[PDB]
Each structure stands twice: as C-alpha cells, then as structure tokens.
Amino acid sequence: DCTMYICGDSTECSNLLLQYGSFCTQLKRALTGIAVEQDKNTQEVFAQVKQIYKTPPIKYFGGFNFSQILPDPSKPSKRSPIEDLLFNKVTLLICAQKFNGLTVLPPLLTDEMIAQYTSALLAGTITSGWTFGAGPALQIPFPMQMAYRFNGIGVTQNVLYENQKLIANQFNSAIGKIQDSLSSTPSALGKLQDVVNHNAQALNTLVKQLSSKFGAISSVLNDILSRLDPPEAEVQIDRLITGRLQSLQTYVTQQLIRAAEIRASANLAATKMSECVLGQSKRVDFCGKGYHLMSFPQSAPHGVVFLHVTYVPAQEKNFTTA
Amino acid sequence: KIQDSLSSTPSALGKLQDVVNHNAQALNTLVKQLSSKFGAISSVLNDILSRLDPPEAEVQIDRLITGRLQSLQTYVTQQLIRAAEIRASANLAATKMSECVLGQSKRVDFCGKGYHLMSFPQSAPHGVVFLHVTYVPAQEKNFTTAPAICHDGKAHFPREGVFVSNGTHWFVTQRNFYEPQIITTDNTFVSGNCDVVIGIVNNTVYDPLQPELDSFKE
Amino acid sequence: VVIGIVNNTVYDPLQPELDSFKE
Amino acid sequence: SFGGVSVITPGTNTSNQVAVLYQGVNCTEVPVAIHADQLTPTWRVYSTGSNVFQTRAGCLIGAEYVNNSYECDIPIGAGICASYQTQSQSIIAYTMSLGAENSVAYSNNSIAIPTNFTISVTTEILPVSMTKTSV
C-alpha cells in the first residue's frame, strides 16, 4: 500500500503524493501479476490428472512395501510419513509489526489438496503404470510392470522373475534409508529455505529503510510539521517522498527477477514430473544416476521432492572377446 | 473440427494477444506521465520559461528532467525483462520445431497428449501454432494373464508381448492392440527351470516343424 | 574381410534331431 | 484497525451485483460493525444484512455458502471460489473441486488390453517475438 508506507496517514502528504502521477498504479500491477503467476505455477505442476484415483484397500504388490509413501489415514491429514518429515523440516513480533502496508496473501491451493493430488498420482502410477498418461488407467500386475521396465534398458525380463524376492528386498532396504538420511542431515532441504529467507529479509530491509532522513530535517512527518510552517515544510518533505519511492522501486525490481528465476525451476519441475513419473526416460542423467526405472513425487512447502529408482551394475568380470 | 473450434471459441489465441496488449499500455503510461508536475510550478517548459527568470528557471526545470529520466529508465528496465521472457519461449518453440516436426519424439507429453505421430507448423502474428497428431487407445477389455508357461518342465517367456487367455485357451498378443495368436516355438524363448518363477501355469506349446516333418518323414 | 576374426563351430539344432529321426 | 477491500463481481454486461471481501480482518470486527460518519469508505449500504461468511483469507459480505463443488470460476484464496449462478440469481461461494472420484480395480492376475484406437489432433500456441521500439 503506497499511501500508508510513503505517508504517515496524513493528508497534505497525500496531496503532494498525488502530484507524482501513476507511480503506484504501475507498482500495484506488477505485484498482482507476480501473485497470479505464482498461483498458476503450482497448478501447472500438480494438476495433471483428470480424476482423483484411490488405492484399493488390499495392499500386496508382490513383495514391495509402499507404506512409506502411501497416505496415512491414522493422521488427521492424508500425509505419508515422508511428507510429514519434509513438512517438519521447513520453518516459516516482526510478523505482527508489518502494518505499514506490506501484507502476505494466502495461496489458492491448500496443502491438503496438494496431498490429494500426490496421492492420486501415486495410486495411478502404482496401479496402472504409464498407461494412464495417455488415456484411462489400465490394469497390470506390479511384477509384470517391473519386468516391462527392465525390458526397456536392455535386460531380459527373466532376470526379474528369477530374482523377484531379492529385488523386492533390495528396494525395501533402499527406501528405508531416505527417512534416516533426511532426519539426520539437516541441510538436505536447503534449497527450499532460501525461498522464504530471501522474501523475509527483503521485507525486513524495506521496513528498516523507513527510518532514514534522506537528507532532510527528520524522518518523522509529525516532527517536521510541528517545527516548520507550510511554505518550506512542503519543500522539505518532498525529499522523503522521492527517497521512499526510489527505495520502493528496487523491491519490485528485484521481485520481478526472482519471479522469473522461480518460474524457470517450476517449468523444469513440471517437465520432470511429466517425463520421469508418467513414463520411462531414456535421457542420460535426467531422472537420477544409472538406468531410470520409476519415480514417485512428494509434496514439500513451496516445492516438490522426487524419488528416483534406478539400476546400477554390481561387481564385474573381465573376459576375452571377438 | 480445428477450424470450427477456432471460429467458435473467441479466446483461443490469448497468449499472442497479451504480447501485443502489454506493449501498448506501456507506451500509453509513458506518454501520460508527461502531464505530471513532479513537484514543480507547471508541466509546460514554455510556461515556466515565460513566467520565471533564468536563475530560477534553471532550478524549476531540473525536477522535471529528473522525473522524466526516471520514468524513461523504468520503461527500459521492464522491457529488458520482457525481452528475456519472450526469448525463453522462442528457444522452447525452436526446440519443439526441431524435435516434433522433423522427426518422432519419444518424450512423454512433449508433442501432445498420447503417442506422438506427426506435427505441422502454422504461422501466426508474433507467434507460431503447432498441430499435433496423436494416438489414443479406445475401449478396452480385461483378461487373465500369467507370467510364464511351462511345457516340457521348462519355463517359457514371451519374446514380444504378454501371455493372455479368455478362460479356455491361452494366447500371446502385443501390448497395445488385441491380436490373439497361437503359442509356438518362435514366439517364445526358453530360459531357466520350472520351479523358480511365481505364478506359472501348465500348458503346451505348439511346434510347427514336428507335424509337417513326421507326416513327410514317414 | 573382418579384422580379428576367430575360428569356431556354430551348433545347428536342426541337424542332429532332424537327421537321427530321418534315418 | 485498517485492512483491505476487494470487489468480486461478474461481468457488468451480465449482472450488476458485487461482493466485498475484507481481507485480513475477522468478521466480528468493523466489517459487521460499521457506523455512519465513522469509516473512510463512503459506500456502506451493504452493511451486515446476513450472508456473512468467514474465510481464512478474510471476511466477505454479499455471498452465501453452498455445500456443493464446482470448477473454480473466480479465485478468492485458501481454497474458496465464487461464481454467479442460480441458488432469482445470486452470488455463491463454494469450495473448489479437484475432480470426480474414481476407484481403480487391482488384481494380481488381471490385465486390460485395448481393442480399438482413435486419432486426435490438438493445438499449441507459442509466442516467438515482441514489437520493436525506439525513443
């Protein structure tokens, strides 16, 4: 809000501010555009399914334990343990002090709806495979889908059938270390924290900038009116309006660049969700190190987390070839 | 139906219209800013020069110069960001034209929803329009499957397809179009034993060579 | 024409089983 | 106790009713306790007059909640959307719907294979350039 930030709810200050034209209709449009862009960004990534599928009550997929990613009905919210661990690792007088005209708007999509979207994607990708990315979901047993996926990386499907129990045990053991590797290392979710830290620090600096003399008598309007008569107090205060407008311009100027920087990453995340999750990727080092097999998404505050299942050759043996 | 959809819906070409709409109101505001006094006696230079002497005119006209310089700087600052935003989309369009048009793309949901087949470009004012041709499966039908088949105490696997049955006889068919076929010794390959795979079924595999052979060899 | 070729024998499944019975 | 006001309206070519959203202020405050010769906005004819709904994104006046679900028409915030339809036409404020429920059937020895296909053509519009200028 320009009028309250620039002018201390006065009247002659507003009269002088009116002489600067549309230096705030321009400022009130960029922020609204940024907000609309932010609302569209999250919708473009998660809203990729026509309906909301739900997993069948029976959960026996041949030996693979998906309990760590499936929603937990015991909790008040339908959040998996991994999602709760992610949500508990990002922390969002000053917050109640920003009555100078700077507010924060709530996102259109509630977290309990992003959780529903993630659950729908998980159910679709665990029940139907990649067939639901083109049309409707199609039934297929999970071992058959995994054999199909091994058949896509140059390995005969008999390897899975002859090593099903071992592969299931390896997957169960591998998925059991992500929770420990997240609860132990606190810097894993370091990329998401900067997004809120920069936005808090910018507002803090903008608020602190208000207590500047800007080459005038004082930074308090009432103090400068109580000591000088209008004829040159009008000239003196003009410096304050000019300085505050110049300071307020830089905030939106930096926010415009940060919005584009966030949009690039949002587009990258949308591409990753469309390629690695809804199908199988042949691009090298795109859906993780090794040979990509499958992926599962998880919801994080102002972000998304992917889980890549890959294939890595073990111990070797040299030979003689012709 | 593309022509009907374009002629019926009046907001299909909304992305291109915003590009030309954002470049008009910017100039409109840049020219409307000339009526602001910027804390001076008047917004007309001739009026100031006709009402004041040079010693104070050289002070009164500096404020307008500074204000107009700032208003001109803001315009180019915003245009520089819009230029990069347009350039990113231009690069994306170039990549899409290189991939989807001049070949066939295996990337999921890159050149349309479904299985991409072809694409054609069409020119538009300050933009380009693509037409993606895809392939979407129609009505389906559930079946009963089995991972493998064991005839002579040996496991058999489908060379390309999946084993399928209607309830009475087993068949082999491809994965995207129902086409039952008789299981032979060339549609399947043998590997392993008859006690390792889970869910195998007992059945027989036809051999084309043996009947025609012993019929002729006798 | 090939460089580094080696000499060996390739088993033909047709020959033994379709000549022993054809005897 | 300053706040902020937003005007939710349908197309003026269609109707002539508006709904005012007081963002950041709970309903029990001035929104329902406006007084003459006491508040800055001159317009106060809306007053309380029932149809007062509390939302996590502020308090809005002039619409009545309905326990239904439709596609979001005019976003409000925190999962609430408003539109202009019937219940003799008023302004409603429902909750956004993600889609229709669909339970998938899973079995350990079942598969589905299509028998026919369908060819479809979809469009895609991408900007390539912007207007040049000089000053």
XYZ file of C-alpha atoms in Angstrom:
698
model
C 0.000 0.000 0.000
C 1.690 3.192 -1.200
C -0.282 5.792 0.737
C 0.414 4.401 4.209
C 4.037 3.423 3.533
C 5.050 6.700 1.881
C 2.832 8.962 4.010
C 2.092 8.544 7.700
C -1.709 8.535 7.229
C -1.534 12.324 6.800
C -3.470 14.485 4.320
C -1.094 17.101 2.897
C 1.431 14.316 2.308
C -1.201 12.540 0.205
C -1.913 15.813 -1.607
C 1.774 16.088 -2.515
C 1.910 12.390 -3.467
C -0.967 12.922 -5.911
C 1.349 15.164 -7.981
C 3.582 12.224 -9.000
C 1.025 10.644 -11.325
C 0.768 6.875 -11.743
C 3.956 5.880 -9.895
C 1.843 3.394 -7.895
C -0.692 2.047 -10.382
C 2.423 0.674 -12.078
C 3.672 -0.674 -8.738
C 0.319 -2.270 -7.855
C 0.130 -4.150 -11.178
C 3.483 -5.956 -11.161
C 2.803 -7.481 -7.738
C -0.635 -8.723 -8.815
C 0.893 -10.223 -11.952
C 3.532 -11.948 -9.825
C 0.849 -13.328 -7.498
C -1.203 -14.669 -10.418
C 1.939 -16.232 -11.895
C 2.714 -17.903 -8.558
C -0.833 -19.263 -8.362
C -0.512 -20.664 -11.895
C 2.920 -22.189 -11.211
C 1.720 -24.703 -8.616
C -1.360 -25.555 -10.689
C 0.749 -26.323 -13.770
C 2.846 -28.921 -11.909
C 0.393 -30.925 -9.792
C -2.888 -30.638 -11.744
C -2.056 -33.220 -14.407
C -4.798 -35.804 -13.719
C -8.440 -35.654 -14.784
C -9.778 -37.614 -11.790
C -8.693 -38.472 -8.244
C -7.843 -42.170 -8.051
C -7.627 -44.006 -4.732
C -5.685 -47.149 -3.894
C -7.585 -50.409 -3.321
C -7.968 -51.475 0.328
C -5.811 -54.571 -0.225
C -2.094 -53.730 -0.455
C 0.073 -56.665 -1.567
C 2.197 -55.820 -4.620
C 4.331 -58.963 -4.765
C 6.822 -58.004 -2.066
C 7.298 -54.253 -2.444
C 6.412 -52.218 0.658
C 4.951 -48.839 -0.333
C 3.736 -47.928 3.166
C 6.339 -45.157 3.470
C 4.857 -43.164 0.560
C 1.169 -44.065 0.666
C -1.139 -41.756 2.646
C -1.653 -42.480 6.335
C -5.348 -42.440 7.348
C -4.465 -42.562 11.061
C -3.212 -38.973 10.974
C -5.798 -36.170 10.726
C -4.407 -35.337 7.272
C -3.726 -37.823 4.471
C 0.047 -37.384 4.624
C 2.691 -40.091 4.373
C 5.482 -40.244 6.982
C 7.987 -38.929 4.427
C 5.704 -35.982 3.666
C 5.360 -35.189 7.378
C 9.131 -35.400 7.855
C 9.616 -32.992 4.942
C 6.923 -30.655 6.297
C 8.506 -30.603 9.772
C 11.942 -29.532 8.472
C 10.990 -26.143 6.958
C 10.137 -23.296 9.338
C 8.299 -20.235 8.027
C 6.979 -9.751 16.649
C 8.015 -8.511 13.208
C 5.292 -10.572 11.516
C 2.722 -8.665 13.593
C 4.620 -5.392 13.064
C 4.125 -5.098 9.295
C 1.193 -2.681 9.498
C 2.992 -0.159 7.258
C 1.145 -1.533 4.210
C 3.042 -4.784 3.496
C 0.903 -7.933 3.648
C 1.097 -11.593 2.617
C -1.601 -13.341 0.609
C -2.588 -16.993 1.113
C -2.098 -19.494 -1.720
C -5.147 -20.637 -3.652
C -4.342 -24.354 -3.301
C -4.331 -25.684 0.259
C -1.706 -28.256 1.238
C -4.459 -30.805 1.893
C -5.318 -30.601 -1.823
C -1.712 -30.966 -2.972
C -1.614 -34.087 -0.798
C -4.722 -35.377 -2.589
C -3.092 -34.726 -5.968
C 0.082 -36.537 -4.895
C -1.962 -39.489 -3.624
C -3.829 -39.646 -6.940
C -0.569 -39.674 -8.912
C 0.876 -42.369 -6.641
C -2.211 -44.572 -6.987
C -2.236 -44.143 -10.761
C 1.468 -44.911 -11.149
C 1.338 -47.926 -8.793
C -1.890 -49.465 -10.165
C -1.753 -48.750 -13.913
C 1.890 -47.970 -14.723
C 2.485 -45.445 -17.511
C -0.713 -46.338 -19.386
C -2.725 -43.661 -17.554
C -0.629 -40.843 -19.030
C -2.308 -41.218 -22.436
C -5.898 -42.178 -21.638
C -7.567 -44.073 -18.803
C -5.879 -46.314 -16.271
C -5.252 -49.897 -17.394
C -4.846 -52.871 -15.070
C -1.459 -54.581 -14.794
C 0.231 -56.578 -12.003
C 3.209 -54.801 -10.468
C 5.771 -57.581 -11.183
C 4.669 -57.545 -14.826
C 5.176 -53.773 -14.959
C 8.636 -54.105 -13.413
C 9.559 -56.803 -15.940
C 8.351 -54.458 -18.681
C 10.578 -51.694 -17.306
C 13.612 -53.998 -17.148
C 12.880 -54.939 -20.759
C 13.391 -51.267 -21.672
C 17.011 -50.987 -20.502
C 18.430 -53.946 -22.433
C 17.931 -56.565 -19.694
C 15.820 -59.648 -20.385
C 12.635 -59.852 -18.323
C 13.569 -63.284 -16.937
C 16.064 -61.594 -14.589
C 13.265 -60.052 -12.515
C 11.201 -63.246 -12.386
C 14.232 -65.297 -11.339
C 15.285 -62.655 -8.769
C 11.966 -61.201 -7.610
C 12.421 -61.714 -3.860
C 15.961 -60.315 -3.839
C 14.929 -57.265 -5.877
C 11.966 -56.606 -3.578
C 14.209 -56.877 -0.512
C 16.767 -54.515 -2.061
C 14.068 -51.954 -2.867
C 12.590 -52.216 0.634
C 16.019 -51.723 2.213
C 16.868 -48.802 -0.088
C 13.602 -46.963 0.576
C 14.214 -47.431 4.309
C 17.251 -45.129 4.345
C 15.686 -41.980 2.854
C 13.897 -41.199 6.119
C 17.122 -41.613 8.102
C 19.153 -39.637 5.551
C 16.647 -36.785 5.872
C 16.176 -36.835 9.658
C 19.960 -36.942 10.189
C 21.258 -34.407 7.662
C 19.542 -31.018 8.186
C 20.975 -29.370 5.043
C 19.196 -31.662 2.563
C 16.208 -29.289 2.315
C 18.433 -26.251 1.935
C 17.109 -25.113 -1.433
C 13.566 -24.512 -0.169
C 14.675 -22.485 2.864
C 16.315 -19.771 0.747
C 12.991 -19.060 -0.978
C 11.457 -17.916 2.311
C 14.663 -16.445 3.782
C 15.132 -14.021 0.883
C 11.471 -12.959 0.956
C 11.649 -12.322 4.715
C 14.955 -10.435 4.545
C 13.741 -8.211 1.701
C 10.659 -7.182 3.685
C 12.771 -6.615 6.801
C 15.154 -4.334 4.895
C 12.231 -2.487 3.294
C 10.695 -1.858 6.723
C 14.026 -0.792 8.243
C 14.592 1.633 5.349
C 11.695 3.776 6.622
C 13.857 5.318 9.385
C 16.116 7.328 7.057
C 16.487 11.103 6.982
C 17.176 11.151 3.208
C 18.971 14.473 3.605
C 16.039 16.148 5.375
C 15.358 17.532 8.848
C 13.942 14.290 10.262
C 12.326 11.014 9.232
C 9.108 11.712 11.192
C 6.435 13.699 9.362
C 4.727 14.989 12.513
C 8.078 16.185 13.869
C 8.810 18.128 10.674
C 5.345 19.715 10.588
C 5.454 20.680 14.279
C 8.593 22.798 13.752
C 8.214 24.446 10.319
C 5.396 26.336 8.629
C 3.930 25.006 5.344
C 5.760 27.238 2.821
C 9.096 25.394 3.103
C 7.981 22.338 5.075
C 6.298 21.415 1.789
C 9.706 21.558 0.099
C 11.435 19.672 2.925
C 9.072 16.689 2.921
C 9.353 16.240 -0.866
C 12.786 14.687 -0.319
C 11.152 11.992 1.834
C 8.565 11.100 -0.831
C 11.260 10.937 -3.513
C 13.507 8.757 -1.361
C 10.709 6.406 -0.338
C 9.538 5.993 -3.941
C 13.105 5.260 -5.040
C 13.503 2.708 -2.233
C 10.170 1.057 -3.056
C 11.042 0.727 -6.756
C 14.018 -1.552 -6.048
C 11.884 -4.041 -4.103
C 9.560 -4.780 -7.023
C 12.526 -4.640 -9.416
C 14.222 -7.490 -7.533
C 10.958 -9.402 -7.098
C 10.434 -9.337 -10.872
C 13.759 -11.127 -11.406
C 13.170 -13.612 -8.588
C 9.771 -14.461 -10.095
C 11.392 -15.426 -13.406
C 14.058 -17.431 -11.581
C 11.342 -19.363 -9.731
C 9.326 -19.826 -12.939
C 12.269 -21.491 -14.685
C 12.564 -24.048 -11.877
C 8.788 -24.568 -11.877
C 8.888 -25.375 -15.596
C 11.786 -27.773 -15.009
C 9.839 -29.500 -12.226
C 6.779 -29.786 -14.470
C 8.885 -31.378 -17.212
C 10.430 -33.823 -14.735
C 7.007 -34.773 -13.365
C 5.667 -35.299 -16.886
C 8.607 -37.410 -18.067
C 10.151 -39.387 -15.193
C 6.875 -40.089 -13.349
C 4.228 -40.559 -16.060
C 6.629 -42.702 -18.089
C 10.127 -44.063 -18.564
C 13.006 -41.848 -19.677
C 15.958 -42.694 -21.916
C 17.774 -39.388 -21.353
C 21.068 -39.983 -19.552
C 21.417 -38.487 -16.057
C 17.951 -36.905 -16.150
C 15.930 -38.956 -13.632
C 18.912 -39.904 -11.466
C 22.229 -41.683 -11.806
C 22.142 -45.014 -13.616
C 19.276 -46.515 -15.616
C 15.940 -44.934 -14.712
C 13.069 -47.256 -13.807
C 10.304 -45.376 -11.936
C 9.673 -42.300 -9.801
C 7.343 -41.088 -7.045
C 6.616 -37.443 -6.149
C 6.155 -35.977 -2.685
C 4.810 -32.606 -1.566
C 7.011 -30.088 0.256
C 6.362 -26.485 1.347
C 6.806 -24.296 -1.743
C 8.432 -27.145 -3.638
C 8.350 -30.771 -4.718
C 10.532 -33.803 -3.982
C 11.154 -36.698 -6.372
C 12.239 -40.252 -5.538
C 14.181 -41.940 -8.342
C 14.529 -45.728 -8.546
C 17.500 -46.724 -10.698
C 19.539 -49.739 -11.789
C 23.278 -49.874 -11.069
C 25.576 -52.735 -12.172
C 27.425 -54.524 -9.374
C 30.823 -56.323 -9.387
C 32.354 -57.039 -12.799
C 34.482 -59.671 -14.531
C 36.835 -59.293 -17.484
C 36.800 -61.656 -20.460
C 38.191 -62.109 -23.977
C 36.044 -61.002 -26.908
C 35.992 -61.403 -30.685
C -13.022 -29.653 -36.247
C -9.981 -27.416 -35.663
C -11.474 -24.644 -37.800
C -14.815 -24.962 -36.002
C -13.128 -24.804 -32.591
C -11.120 -21.727 -33.590
C -14.126 -19.932 -35.101
C -16.380 -20.793 -32.136
C -14.147 -20.083 -29.137
C -13.161 -16.375 -29.162
C -10.351 -16.687 -26.574
C -8.219 -19.490 -28.040
C -5.478 -17.064 -29.147
C -4.987 -15.414 -25.783
C -1.242 -15.876 -25.397
C -0.462 -13.923 -28.574
C -2.908 -11.129 -27.720
C -1.261 -10.459 -24.347
C 2.110 -9.872 -26.032
C 0.724 -7.032 -28.151
C -1.520 -5.733 -25.350
C 1.366 -5.331 -22.891
C 3.371 -3.304 -25.435
C 0.662 -0.651 -25.916
C -0.275 0.293 -22.353
C 3.423 0.699 -21.524
C 3.751 3.411 -24.175
C 0.401 4.843 -23.073
C 1.625 5.269 -19.491
C 4.986 6.583 -20.714
C 3.190 9.313 -22.668
C 0.602 10.029 -19.948
C 3.399 10.595 -17.419
C 4.221 13.848 -19.254
C 1.271 15.574 -17.536
C 2.746 15.207 -14.028
C 4.135 18.354 -12.418
C 6.743 16.380 -10.413
C 6.532 18.977 -7.651
C 7.059 21.986 -9.934
C 5.050 25.079 -10.835
C 3.834 23.637 -14.144
C 4.335 20.724 -16.527
C 4.985 23.008 -19.531
C 8.558 24.144 -20.145
C 7.471 27.125 -22.252
C 5.164 28.344 -19.475
C 7.996 28.132 -16.933
C 10.373 29.987 -19.253
C 7.696 32.635 -19.830
C 6.903 33.126 -16.123
C 10.340 32.984 -14.444
C 13.823 34.389 -14.953
C 16.735 32.093 -15.935
C 18.301 31.957 -12.432
C 15.176 30.261 -11.040
C 14.133 28.610 -14.309
C 17.337 26.551 -14.231
C 16.152 25.234 -10.847
C 12.472 24.706 -11.673
C 13.186 22.670 -14.828
C 15.689 20.292 -13.194
C 12.933 18.471 -11.290
C 11.044 17.691 -14.500
C 14.264 16.435 -16.102
C 14.948 14.074 -13.193
C 11.373 12.793 -13.094
C 11.224 12.163 -16.834
C 14.618 10.438 -16.748
C 13.368 8.100 -14.013
C 10.140 7.413 -15.917
C 12.185 6.585 -19.020
C 14.548 4.308 -17.080
C 11.655 2.283 -15.650
C 10.304 1.545 -19.138
C 13.551 0.089 -20.486
C 14.074 -1.796 -17.214
C 10.742 -3.590 -17.650
C 11.278 -4.112 -21.388
C 14.599 -5.853 -20.711
C 12.829 -8.426 -18.521
C 10.002 -8.932 -21.017
C 12.575 -9.483 -23.778
C 14.204 -12.351 -21.873
C 10.784 -13.809 -21.071
C 9.949 -13.825 -24.792
C 13.376 -15.214 -25.731
C 12.935 -18.223 -23.440
C 9.661 -19.119 -25.163
C 11.275 -18.573 -28.570
C 14.022 -21.053 -27.671
C 11.408 -23.545 -26.467
C 9.491 -23.149 -29.737
C 12.683 -23.669 -31.745
C 13.449 -26.879 -29.848
C 9.872 -28.109 -30.301
C 10.002 -27.390 -34.040
C 13.320 -29.230 -34.325
C 12.068 -32.301 -32.442
C 8.356 -32.855 -33.112
C 8.223 -31.650 -36.729
C 11.445 -33.029 -38.241
C 11.053 -36.421 -36.566
C 9.275 -38.552 -33.994
C 9.630 -37.847 -30.274
C 9.608 -40.484 -27.536
C 9.356 -37.894 -24.746
C 6.076 -38.239 -22.861
C 3.655 -35.303 -23.176
C 6.065 -33.154 -25.199
C 4.399 -33.090 -28.639
C 0.838 -33.736 -27.483
C -1.114 -35.934 -25.064
C -0.744 -39.561 -26.109
C 1.632 -41.290 -28.527
C 3.045 -38.660 -30.878
C 2.909 -39.373 -34.613
C 3.430 -36.158 -36.640
C 3.180 -32.373 -36.376
C 2.667 -29.384 -38.664
C 3.524 -25.721 -38.036
C 1.336 -22.746 -38.877
C 2.385 -19.096 -38.914
C 0.637 -16.572 -36.676
C 1.188 -12.871 -35.919
C 4.102 -12.732 -33.461
C 3.994 -16.456 -32.797
C 3.633 -19.964 -34.177
C 0.913 -22.616 -33.926
C 1.510 -26.373 -33.966
C -0.891 -29.198 -34.813
C -0.057 -32.445 -33.010
C -1.360 -35.793 -34.273
C -1.510 -38.460 -31.567
C -2.785 -41.999 -30.989
C -5.206 -42.746 -28.145
C -6.379 -46.297 -27.316
C -10.133 -46.860 -27.477
C -12.366 -49.150 -25.371
C -10.506 -51.964 -23.610
C -11.312 -55.394 -22.192
C -9.990 -57.161 -19.104
C -8.359 -60.588 -19.328
C -6.425 -63.154 -17.286
C -2.640 -63.335 -17.629
C 0.273 -65.500 -16.484
C 3.973 -64.601 -16.176
C 5.241 -67.713 -17.988
C 4.331 -71.148 -19.364
C 5.996 -74.493 -18.583
C 5.523 -77.210 -21.200
C 8.372 -79.752 -21.012
C 9.419 -78.910 -17.476
C 10.984 -75.714 -18.851
C 9.855 -72.126 -18.391
C 8.802 -70.151 -21.468
C 8.634 -66.372 -21.775
C 7.037 -64.152 -24.446
C 9.574 -62.807 -26.923
C 7.482 -59.670 -27.531
C 4.089 -59.437 -25.863
C 2.207 -60.889 -22.916
C 0.515 -64.235 -22.363
C -3.271 -63.953 -22.287
C -6.329 -66.199 -22.116
C -10.088 -65.821 -22.475
C -10.742 -68.522 -19.840
C -10.337 -71.634 -22.005
C -7.280 -71.294 -24.269
C -4.037 -69.379 -23.787
C -2.759 -66.875 -26.338
C 0.047 -64.390 -26.965
C -0.586 -60.829 -28.134
C 1.134 -57.468 -28.380
C 0.782 -54.887 -25.628
C -1.187 -52.153 -27.430
C -3.642 -53.927 -29.767
C -5.623 -57.100 -29.119
C -4.445 -59.753 -31.579
C -4.547 -63.327 -30.231
C -2.110 -65.866 -31.641
C -1.128 -69.481 -31.037
C 1.914 -70.008 -28.825
C 4.696 -71.605 -30.878
C 8.431 -72.240 -30.528
C 9.284 -68.961 -32.297
C 7.004 -66.606 -30.340
C 8.693 -67.636 -27.067
C 12.187 -68.308 -25.740
C 13.157 -70.873 -23.105
C 15.143 -69.910 -20.009
C 15.506 -71.370 -16.529
C 13.654 -74.205 -14.831
C 10.029 -74.890 -13.876
C 10.268 -74.063 -10.157
C 11.671 -70.515 -9.935
C 9.018 -68.161 -11.369
C 5.920 -67.346 -9.312
C 2.518 -67.870 -10.913
C 3.472 -70.099 -13.846
C 0.731 -72.208 -15.436
C 0.834 -75.665 -17.005
C 0.137 -75.700 -20.747
C 1.560 -76.890 -24.067
C 3.373 -75.033 -26.850
C 2.851 -75.939 -30.497
C 5.833 -76.785 -32.697
C 5.220 -76.110 -36.418
C 8.097 -78.320 -37.571
C 7.254 -81.677 -35.974
C 3.819 -82.477 -37.560
C 4.803 -81.426 -41.074
C 8.046 -83.365 -40.546
C 6.802 -86.724 -39.249
C 3.938 -86.527 -41.740
C 6.547 -86.231 -44.509
C 9.370 -88.235 -42.896
C 7.073 -91.279 -42.641
C 37.314 -59.043 -44.715
C 36.920 -58.907 -40.934
C 39.870 -57.987 -38.708
C 40.363 -60.065 -35.575
C 38.003 -62.865 -36.601
C 38.304 -66.251 -34.888
C 37.540 -69.829 -35.907
C 34.876 -71.893 -34.140
C 31.790 -74.033 -34.782
C 28.131 -72.992 -34.628
C 25.670 -75.648 -33.488
C 22.639 -76.205 -35.710
C 19.664 -77.609 -33.741
C 18.102 -78.854 -36.988
C 20.834 -81.308 -37.961
C 21.026 -83.865 -35.089
C 17.355 -84.151 -34.189
C 16.145 -84.000 -37.809
C 18.732 -86.432 -39.188
C 18.601 -89.050 -36.420
C 14.844 -89.434 -36.909
C 15.105 -89.134 -40.702
C 17.409 -92.189 -40.725
C -7.865 -1.488 12.601
C -7.137 -0.863 8.913
C -7.483 -3.697 6.419
C -8.216 -4.023 2.712
C -11.247 -4.435 0.445
C -11.650 -6.401 -2.784
C -14.653 -6.319 -5.116
C -15.809 -9.666 -6.517
C -18.149 -9.050 -9.445
C -19.343 -10.936 -12.520
C -19.349 -9.330 -15.945
C -21.119 -5.971 -15.940
C -22.622 -6.997 -19.289
C -24.363 -9.850 -17.428
C -25.355 -8.674 -13.933
C -24.980 -5.706 -11.582
C -24.217 -7.251 -8.162
C -20.898 -7.241 -6.302
C -19.430 -8.942 -3.241
C -16.933 -7.173 -0.975
C -14.123 -9.136 0.691
C -12.455 -7.671 3.789
C -9.047 -9.356 3.725
C -7.093 -9.913 6.932
C -9.947 -8.848 9.242
C -12.206 -11.236 11.136
C -15.959 -10.907 10.668
C -16.731 -9.804 14.243
C -14.788 -6.543 13.749
C -15.854 -3.337 11.932
C -16.955 -5.318 8.787
C -20.173 -6.155 10.665
C -19.942 -3.101 12.968
C -19.672 -0.214 10.505
C -21.034 3.119 11.729
C -22.158 6.266 9.935
C -19.707 9.192 9.943
C -17.057 6.815 11.302
C -15.415 4.978 8.376
C -13.400 6.006 5.321
C -15.266 4.124 2.533
C -18.323 6.198 1.672
C -20.320 3.184 0.479
C -21.896 1.304 3.385
C -25.299 0.204 2.023
C -24.209 -3.449 2.088
C -23.788 -3.344 5.893
C -24.233 -6.759 7.519
C -27.611 -7.874 6.118
C -26.842 -11.572 6.670
C -24.920 -13.605 4.058
C -21.755 -13.128 6.134
C -19.220 -15.933 5.687
C -15.862 -16.320 7.427
C -12.881 -17.413 5.333
C -9.209 -17.975 6.130
C -8.447 -15.212 3.583
C -10.696 -12.669 5.310
C -14.403 -11.979 5.672
C -16.578 -11.461 2.587
C -20.005 -9.801 2.518
C -22.721 -10.399 -0.070
C -22.486 -14.132 -0.822
C -23.913 -17.276 0.769
C -22.023 -20.546 1.140
C -23.378 -23.647 -0.602
C -22.364 -27.216 0.268
C -21.572 -28.138 -3.332
C -18.477 -28.410 -5.535
C -17.792 -26.941 -8.977
C -14.801 -25.817 -11.009
C -13.198 -22.619 -9.737
C -14.541 -19.561 -11.578
C -13.328 -16.543 -9.578
C -10.493 -17.385 -7.151
C -10.700 -15.971 -3.630
C -7.949 -17.698 -1.639
C -7.331 -20.650 0.688
C -9.449 -22.933 -1.492
C -12.607 -20.805 -1.837
C -14.128 -19.804 -5.178
C -17.122 -17.669 -6.121
C -19.324 -17.505 -9.207
C -22.645 -16.154 -10.498
C -25.297 -18.852 -10.938
C -28.702 -19.811 -9.547
C -29.437 -20.978 -5.992
C -33.621 -15.314 -8.835
C -29.857 -15.326 -9.423
C -27.417 -14.688 -6.576
C -23.674 -14.973 -5.877
C -22.422 -18.166 -4.232
C -19.074 -19.100 -2.666
C -18.425 -22.847 -2.785
C -15.276 -24.919 -2.211
C -13.048 -25.766 -5.166
C -13.377 -29.312 -6.510
C -10.331 -31.202 -7.761
C -12.375 -33.707 -9.752
C -14.629 -36.739 -9.637
C -13.711 -39.734 -7.503
C -12.677 -42.856 -9.410
C -11.681 -46.081 -7.656
C -9.327 -48.266 -9.692
C -9.591 -52.056 -9.658
C -6.395 -54.001 -8.955
C -5.755 -57.736 -9.170
C -2.613 -59.853 -9.099
C -3.589 -61.931 -12.164
C -5.578 -59.473 -14.295
C -4.704 -57.205 -17.221
C -6.557 -54.920 -19.634
C -5.787 -54.666 -23.353
C -7.487 -52.242 -25.776
C -9.120 -53.453 -28.977
C -9.576 -50.204 -30.950
C -7.882 -46.821 -31.298
C -8.682 -43.180 -32.031
C -6.824 -40.384 -33.835
C -6.967 -36.891 -32.327
C -5.469 -33.511 -33.230
C -4.548 -30.898 -30.614
C -3.206 -27.361 -30.981
C -0.478 -25.367 -29.243
C 0.280 -21.629 -29.406
C 3.698 -20.193 -28.523
C 4.870 -16.559 -28.744
C 8.072 -16.041 -30.709
C 8.695 -12.295 -30.822
C 7.701 -8.875 -29.495
C 7.356 -5.416 -31.018
C 10.440 -3.265 -31.563
C 10.616 0.369 -30.486
C 12.888 3.393 -30.179
C 12.926 6.533 -28.027
